[PDB]
């Protein structure tokens, strides 16, 4: 009755609500022993277990995904409830939830999720010790990258033609690329894969480069940082695009090499280039050279969410 599109990706939760309202927020939380309930702390077990989510998750013990699209996995429980509280959608309200998973592990993850998810009546606990109830009838699913081409193509920004689309995303941990064919929307299972490399790698070496050069140690959320701009660190102003920008390159480099490789000559069927995900804010541009005149670039209002809003549309379309 009421439909949500839902992402949980490795690094942000997505939620594509009423109207087409969105949301997102770290996929990062954290158990909490306060008696208390700015910061909501919320409980899916009517307070036995509490924790807080997103932006505030702070300390030791922060727990996050171990990949996409892992919807079934203990990690992904919390950010699902806290999506849904986000969402503010209130009542026990019946929702069909839209969401997708890489390719690879489809089926596997799409059975878990189901198992884990559906015909479920999920009661969360939050502020002032409020209750927001959610029957979960229906969640319907599409491989990650074709809820993004399924959006683009709804959008008018894509066109169903002979020749592939390929959706890059660049995450933190991985890339994940999937072949559609443009006919009839399909993935090309011979021609999608995830490459085991993504942003955090370019952190980590922005990371160790300055260790070597200062001796300091820099947490991780501020190295990412260091990425685009300079900061500052014990009183000392590290990184920024002079330094990243070389280590950026080789990211987008070894990226190329490995589509490259895996599409051999099927690149010549290649009509459309597609980046997505937050990696594709830094180097997007540089996928152009796979095949000249075929960049995709999405707005910038839409990068982040691309697939969350084709998940949505699938499942109203359910």
Do not use: C
Not at 41 to 57: E, M, N, R
Not at 112 to 138: C, D, M, S, W, Y
Not at 220 to 244: C, I, N, T, W, Y
Request: glycine fraction near 12%; hydrophobic fraction near 40%; aromatic fraction near 6%.
């Amino acid at each position: 009755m009421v439909v949500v599109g839902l992402d949980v990706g490795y690094g942000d939760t997505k939620v594509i609500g009423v109207d087409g309202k969105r949301i997102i927020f770290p996929s990062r939380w954290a158990v909490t022993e306060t008696e208390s309930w700015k910061i909501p702390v919320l409980s899916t077990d009517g307070g036995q277990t509490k924790f807080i989510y997103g932006k505030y998750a702070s300390g030791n013990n922060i727990r996050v995904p171990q990949g996409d699209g892992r919807l079934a996995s203990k990690e992904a429980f919390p950010l699902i409830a806290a999506a849904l509280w986000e969402s503010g959608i209130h009542n026990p309200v019946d929702l069909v939830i839209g969401s997708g998973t890489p390719l690879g592990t489809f089926d596997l993850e799409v059975k878990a999720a189901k198992e884990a998810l559906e015909n479920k009546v999920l009661t969360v606990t939050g502020p002032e010790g409020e209750v927001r109830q959610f029957n979960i009838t229906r969640l319907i699913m599409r491989p990650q990258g074709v809820g993004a081409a399924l959006y683009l193509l709804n959008q008018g920004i894509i066109e169903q033609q002979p020749g592939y689309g390929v959706v890059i995303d660049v995450g933190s941990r991985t890339t994940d690329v999937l072949t559609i064919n443009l006919m009839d929307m399909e993935p090309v299972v011979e021609l999608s894969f995830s490459l085991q490399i993504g942003v955090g790698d370019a952190i980590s070496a922005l990371s160790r480069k300055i260790a070597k050069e200062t001796g300091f140690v820099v947490p991780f959320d501020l190295a990412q940082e260091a990425l685009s701009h300079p900061v500052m660190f014990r009183q000392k102003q590290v990184g920024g695009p002079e330094v990243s920008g070389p280590i950026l390159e080789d990211l987008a480099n070894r990226i190329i090499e490995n589509i490259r490789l895996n599409l051999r000559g099927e690149v010549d069927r290649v009509t459309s280039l597609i980046p997505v995900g937050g990696g594709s804010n830094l180097i997007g541009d540089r996928f152009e050279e796979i095949a000249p005149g075929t960049l995709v670039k999405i707005k910038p209002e839409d990068l982040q969410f691309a697939n969350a809003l084709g998940y949505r549309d699938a499942a109203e379309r359910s």
